[PDB]
Amino acid sequence: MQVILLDKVANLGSLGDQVNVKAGYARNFLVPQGKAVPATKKNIEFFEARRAELEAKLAEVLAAANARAEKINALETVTIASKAGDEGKLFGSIGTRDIADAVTAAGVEVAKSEVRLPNGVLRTTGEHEVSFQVHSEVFAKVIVNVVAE
Amino acid sequence: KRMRVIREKVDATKQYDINEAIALLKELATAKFVESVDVAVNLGIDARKSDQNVRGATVLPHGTGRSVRVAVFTQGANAEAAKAAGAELVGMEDLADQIKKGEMNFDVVIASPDAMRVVGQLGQVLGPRGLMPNPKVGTVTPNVAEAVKNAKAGQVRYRNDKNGIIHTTIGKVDFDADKLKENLEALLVALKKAKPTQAKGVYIKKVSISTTMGAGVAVDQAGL
Amino acid sequence: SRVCQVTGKRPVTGNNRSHALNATKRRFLPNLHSHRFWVESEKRFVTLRVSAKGMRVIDKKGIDTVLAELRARGEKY
Amino acid sequence: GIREKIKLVSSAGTGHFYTTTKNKRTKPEKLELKKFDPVVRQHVIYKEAK
Amino acid sequence: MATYYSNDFRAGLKIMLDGEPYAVEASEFVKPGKGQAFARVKLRRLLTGTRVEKTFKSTDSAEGADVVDMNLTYLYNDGEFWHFMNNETFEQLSADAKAIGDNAKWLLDQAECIVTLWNGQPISVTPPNFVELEIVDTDPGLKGDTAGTGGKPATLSTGAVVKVPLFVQIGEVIKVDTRSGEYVSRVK
RNA sequence: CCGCCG
RNA sequence: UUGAGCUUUGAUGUGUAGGAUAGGUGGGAGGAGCCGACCUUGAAAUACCACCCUUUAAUGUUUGAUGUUCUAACGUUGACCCGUAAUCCGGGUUGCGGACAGUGUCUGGUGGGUAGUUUGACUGGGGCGGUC
RNA sequence: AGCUUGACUGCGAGCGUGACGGCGCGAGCAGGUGCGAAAGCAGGUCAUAGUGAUCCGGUGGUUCUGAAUGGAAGGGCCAUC
């Protein structure tokens, strides 16, 4: 292919290479999610001046915001006390909408989608570790203590 | 060493041509006495298919003379006729007492349709275990054995089966006219390609190396 | 019907010749597949029933280049 | 049927051939006849081929 | 080419259809008023031969096989294969373990066991009605009490096991039949 | 292990 | 995680009998040392080395064979929301599948489900039998 | 019983016989051989059955043609399957 990279892709590119990929990996993923541009006789000219200085840094300082979007809620400990069962066996499992709303209402305004779940949908009252991915390499460890009430 | 320089003149990356190392076969070896040549020829045979066996008789042109002792199993006038054809023990079941004793003095068993009742009935295992029979496939048993052994005493080298691909034949003494030997290896090709088992595989001749006895290596080509 | 949006491939006909040369009218069909294409300017999805060589054209040409050609042919997309 | 057909090929420079039959499974020695070759206009030896 | 029609062949006429040779054992040719003719043929498979029943119509039927059943002389064994010789023409012949099947015991040597060769190669070997063999592993059969036929089993030289009476020990060369496998008597 | 009947 | 292949570096074939710690055969008197054939042999007798079977491991292996993980193509005859007064359709979210399924072209198989057809002549009527 | 390859190539006046395709006989002519001292005989066998037309295709030979020209391919002819 003619793939010029707008971004750091984790196994092939270094922010501006010409990687020869399969065509389905270009149409469905890398082009619509901002990771690539086709380079057909104009975009090599459109990368030559204006992108390696300006647009190689407009994502880089928003990635230096990924260093600073994490410490907005620097406490990183969460008390959720929704409805539970009787001696364990939780009433209703806390999903990604309620984990984000436990963070959006107090702390980071990150959305639903960047909440990870290493151990399912938390069918248990207890102390739990919920990852908040903001960067492809910078992973958080914000503790969600599911509490019975 | 003494066996190390032998290894030094073997380049497996190059397939050598016709004229190249055949003239160098006295150079590729450090033999004490006078030796001979061998020829390796490979013919694609499946080991579990008996329809692909190649046996016969290769009359061979020109060089070596009467050096093969040949046994006779004939009757009639041919008990005294092939005595003019140079063979040593001409006869009958006198050579069946020697099968029972296990004697190594002959290499070839040639008979007639008179003598087709002896080795097919008395020397059964001991004639084909080491292989020395005759029928209507090899040229072993006609009834014209007089003019048969006027040449088969001289130059016949028996193209025989192996379980795998290999059909190793024998080159002559090193001190002949070696250019004619490149026909003596070539006028076995047109007889091996003369008639096969009509069930050959991919190739006919894959690998061919004409060794001397123990030291020479010359990669022959199946094409040229 | 079974028509490519991009290249206009409709089903042609042809014979199904056998080993005894028996002719029988079959119908060649195009390798159609409704793909949901990304337009960077419109910032949305356009669902086109392209053929498989029609995706090859949008691999060379722009998606916006091909959509302007549909707009010239009275295509609603 | 049994008596198959062979091809006597001339031992001269040309490729004129006589064709004939030979019962192979009774007398399997080859034919070495001496026939007339109309390309050479001589009477050279012919030899069996297929 | 030797094509056959089903109203022709009697018995033993070896035919070749569906990739296998067949011997016809018998065939009953019937045809009835207001019907066509058919021959309910009792065939015999030749390579794996148990039996097969086909009811051919009057047309068509099969090509024949090169199927010569001549006398061969067992003379040799090596690895797997078993070599044979004609006492009329002295041509070579090589049988296989699939062709020897369930009869690798019964030959000893110089036996005139017939074979069926199919298309220039043998697939079957028929050992004779009797062969004489030697017992190498048999218990020294003692009477003891036994009032009522003692019958001890004997392992033979060819790796066969037969049931023998109590007076043959080891080196008592005994002849058996091959069609069943029973002791018949003792050769002396 | 085998061993029927007068 | 793997399965068979090549140039390739080489180690590796243990009973009958020959002192045994014999792969096959065609050659068969070669390497402070010492065999070998001769002989004892078996169904084949060994040195020397050849072409190789049959195992082993290294690499570039051609690669396929499957088998988890993921989501973005794709599917959804799952919930909700909107067009919308609409158990259609479209879009928007979300869940579950997921590079499977499905489809196009080429291709092997099966295929009286279906279609076009063939099924000879003489004959003391025709069939049968016989014959050409 | 000996020697042998005439079971040879190019033709062939003249008839015989078939509706035709075809089939049969043939002295002689040229070239080259065999046998016989020679005259001579020999282009299969005592004669009469032992067999299939075309089309399509296979192999060998021959520059006879060879789609601009030079080759070749493919055709043709000849021997054949």
Side-chain angles (χ1 to χ4, degrees):
Chain A
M1 291 292 288
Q2 291 292 323
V3 170
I4 180 70
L5 285 86
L6 295 177
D7 199 358
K8 293 291 290 183
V9 175
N11 206 5
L12 51 90
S14 65
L15 182 57
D17 289 330
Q18 291 183 359
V19 183
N20 194 352
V21 301
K22 293 181 176 70
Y25 184 54
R27 283 193 294 265
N28 302 319
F29 182 72
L30 291 174
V31 171
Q33 295 186 2
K35 300 291 186 180
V37 173
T40 304
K41 297 299 290 183
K42 291 182 182 179
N43 289 315
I44 299 171
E45 294 170 349
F46 291 161
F47 190 80
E48 183 174 359
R50 291 181 181 177
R51 293 182 183 176
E53 294 182 356
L54 180 62
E55 291 181 354
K57 296 183 182 180
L58 295 176
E60 184 174 359
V61 299
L62 295 176
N66 287 322
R68 293 181 181 178
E70 182 178 358
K71 294 179 184 179
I72 299 169
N73 192 0
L75 294 174
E76 296 176 354
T77 178
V78 177
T79 301
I80 298 173
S82 66
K83 184 63 69 178
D86 292 330
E87 282 85 6
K89 302 298 185 291
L90 184 68
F91 183 80
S93 300
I94 295 95
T96 61
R97 293 182 180 178
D98 292 331
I99 300 167
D101 288 332
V103 180
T104 301
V108 183
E109 293 180 353
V110 71
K112 174 177 70 68
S113 61
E114 283 82 3
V115 175
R116 298 298 182 272
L117 283 173
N119 198 359
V121 295
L122 297 179
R123 297 183 180 180
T124 307
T125 292
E127 179 179 0
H128 297 284
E129 184 177 1
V130 177
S131 295
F132 290 160
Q133 296 187 358
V134 293
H135 187 268
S136 64
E137 296 178 353
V138 179
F139 293 158
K141 292 180 181 179
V142 174
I143 296 298
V144 173
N145 191 3
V146 180
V147 181
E149 183 178 1
Chain B
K1 287 187 177 180
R2 295 177 181 176
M3 301 299 287
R4 184 178 292 171
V5 186
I6 298 168
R7 291 175 181 173
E8 291 175 354
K9 290 179 179 179
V10 179
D11 289 331
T13 59
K14 294 180 181 180
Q15 288 186 357
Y16 294 105
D17 292 331
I18 297 170
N19 305 317
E20 292 176 350
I22 290 175
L24 307 181
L25 294 173
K26 298 175 186 174
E27 303 180 358
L28 296 170
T30 59
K32 291 179 181 177
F33 295 112
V34 174
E35 285 186 352
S36 69
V37 191
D38 287 330
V39 174
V41 175
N42 293 317
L43 295 175
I45 295 172
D46 290 331
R48 292 180 181 177
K49 292 181 181 179
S50 66
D51 285 328
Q52 296 177 356
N53 291 318
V54 178
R55 291 179 183 176
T58 71
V59 175
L60 293 189
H62 293 187
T64 61
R66 293 184 181 179
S67 64
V68 175
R69 293 179 180 177
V70 177
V72 190
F73 283 91
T74 59
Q75 297 177 359
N78 287 318
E80 294 178 354
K83 289 185 177 179
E88 293 180 356
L89 292 177
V90 179
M92 282 300 291
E93 296 177 353
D94 288 328
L95 287 168
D97 288 330
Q98 302 183 1
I99 293 170
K100 293 180 180 180
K101 292 180 181 179
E103 297 184 356
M104 293 301 292
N105 296 316
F106 294 102
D107 292 330
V108 185
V109 172
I110 290 171
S112 59
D114 329 359
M116 249 349 177
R117 293 180 181 177
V118 173
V119 184
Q121 293 180 357
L122 292 177
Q124 287 185 356
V125 175
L126 297 171
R129 176 89 181 201
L131 317 111
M132 18 207 311
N134 69 269
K136 279 223 190 162
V137 175
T139 64
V140 176
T141 60
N143 285 317
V144 201
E146 294 179 354
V148 164
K149 292 195 178 188
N150 286 318
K152 290 190 182 179
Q155 292 181 0
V156 172
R157 290 178 179 176
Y158 291 91
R159 182 187 299 165
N160 293 318
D161 291 326
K162 290 181 183 180
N163 296 317
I165 306 170
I166 302 165
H167 290 276
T168 39
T169 63
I170 305 168
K172 291 180 178 175
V173 185
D174 301 334
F175 293 94
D176 295 334
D178 297 335
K179 293 184 181 179
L180 296 172
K181 294 176 179 177
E182 294 177 354
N183 292 317
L184 294 171
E185 296 176 354
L187 295 174
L188 295 175
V189 179
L191 298 174
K192 284 187 177 182
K193 294 178 181 178
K195 190 239 58 259
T197 73
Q198 265 231 5
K200 291 180 180 177
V202 177
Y203 294 98
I204 299 169
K205 296 185 179 183
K206 291 181 181 180
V207 183
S208 59
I209 292 171
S210 67
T211 61
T212 62
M213 295 287 283
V217 167
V219 174
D220 292 330
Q221 292 179 356
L224 297 177
Chain C
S1 63
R2 289 187 180 97
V3 175
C4 179
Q5 293 294 109
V6 177
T7 62
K9 287 179 175 291
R10 56 180 180 174
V12 296
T13 55
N15 284 318
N16 195 355
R17 291 299 187 98
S18 66
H19 178 71
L21 291 168
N22 295 111
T24 295
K25 303 297 291 182
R26 54 91 62 85
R27 189 177 71 176
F28 293 92
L29 298 170
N31 194 3
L32 288 171
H33 190 267
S34 297
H35 194 274
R36 192 175 62 195
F37 284 97
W38 171 250
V39 182
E40 183 70 28
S41 181
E42 296 288 328
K43 296 179 182 180
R44 70 176 185 89
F45 283 151
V46 175
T47 309
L48 296 176
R49 191 178 179 182
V50 291
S51 65
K53 202 178 79 170
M55 299 182 71
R56 299 281 307 280
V57 172
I58 309 171
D59 191 73
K60 286 189 74 67
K61 297 179 184 180
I63 180 64
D64 191 76
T65 305
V66 175
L67 261 61
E69 301 177 358
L70 294 171
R71 185 173 176 268
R73 292 179 292 180
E75 296 291 327
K76 185 174 180 179
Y77 57 88
Chain D
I2 292 173
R3 192 175 183 89
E4 69 191 5
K5 60 185 75 175
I6 60 170
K7 186 171 77 172
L8 293 172
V9 170
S10 178
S11 65
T14 181
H16 181 267
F17 58 90
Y18 285 91
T19 181
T20 180
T21 62
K22 186 177 78 174
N23 193 358
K24 187 69 176 179
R25 289 180 294 172
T26 56
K27 299 298 290 182
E29 69 270 14
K30 294 183 289 294
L31 292 181
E32 295 289 324
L33 288 168
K34 188 177 180 182
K35 293 183 177 295
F36 181 79
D37 194 1
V39 177
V40 185
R41 295 173 67 191
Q42 204 68 39
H43 208 76
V44 202
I45 297 99
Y46 277 75
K47 290 181 181 180
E48 178 264 330
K50 293 187 286 186
Chain E
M1 183 181 287
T3 183
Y4 298 108
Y5 291 93
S6 68
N7 202 3
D8 297 332
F9 60 92
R10 298 180 292 173
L13 191 141
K14 303 279 192 293
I15 60 171
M16 179 63 200
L17 64 313
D18 290 331
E20 298 294 328
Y22 291 98
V24 53
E25 176 178 357
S27 69
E28 293 179 354
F29 331 146
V30 207
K31 111 278 273 71
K34 253 145 164 305
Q36 63 171 351
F38 59 81
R40 53 176 79 99
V41 176
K42 303 182 291 292
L43 290 172
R44 178 77 68 193
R45 292 182 64 86
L46 199 38
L47 201 150
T48 61
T50 300
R51 201 184 189 183
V52 69
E53 291 290 329
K54 287 183 185 292
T55 63
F56 293 102
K57 298 293 181 68
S58 180
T59 61
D60 282 324
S61 61
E63 188 68 27
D66 290 330
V67 69
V68 181
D69 303 340
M70 57 182 176
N71 302 116
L72 274 302
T73 297
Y74 174 71
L75 65 90
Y76 181 73
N77 194 359
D78 192 358
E80 294 293 328
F81 52 89
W82 291 268
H83 277 286
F84 294 95
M85 189 74 78
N86 294 114
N87 295 117
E88 70 273 15
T89 183
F90 298 97
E91 183 178 0
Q92 294 296 325
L93 190 140
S94 178
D96 299 333
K98 187 178 180 180
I100 207 70
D102 297 332
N103 282 314
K105 300 183 289 184
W106 296 113
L107 43 286
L108 184 280
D109 200 2
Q110 65 176 356
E112 292 88 4
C113 57
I114 65 169
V115 301
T116 65
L117 65 91
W118 174 58
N119 203 1
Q121 196 71 255
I123 304 169
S124 72
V125 177
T126 303
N129 283 318
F130 295 95
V131 291
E132 65 271 15
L133 288 164
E134 183 185 0
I135 46 178
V136 298
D137 288 328
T138 313
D139 51 349
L142 195 34
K143 353 139 180 157
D145 195 2
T146 313
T149 302
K152 61 181 169 65
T155 306
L156 197 59
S157 295
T158 180
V161 53
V162 296
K163 179 181 177 182
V164 300
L166 273 74
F167 61 89
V168 286
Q169 284 72 234
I170 278 168
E172 292 289 328
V173 284
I174 53 97
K175 74 176 183 66
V176 286
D177 59 352
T178 67
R179 291 182 179 271
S180 67
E182 286 182 353
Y183 181 82
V184 284
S185 71
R186 177 187 60 192
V187 293
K188 297 184 72 65

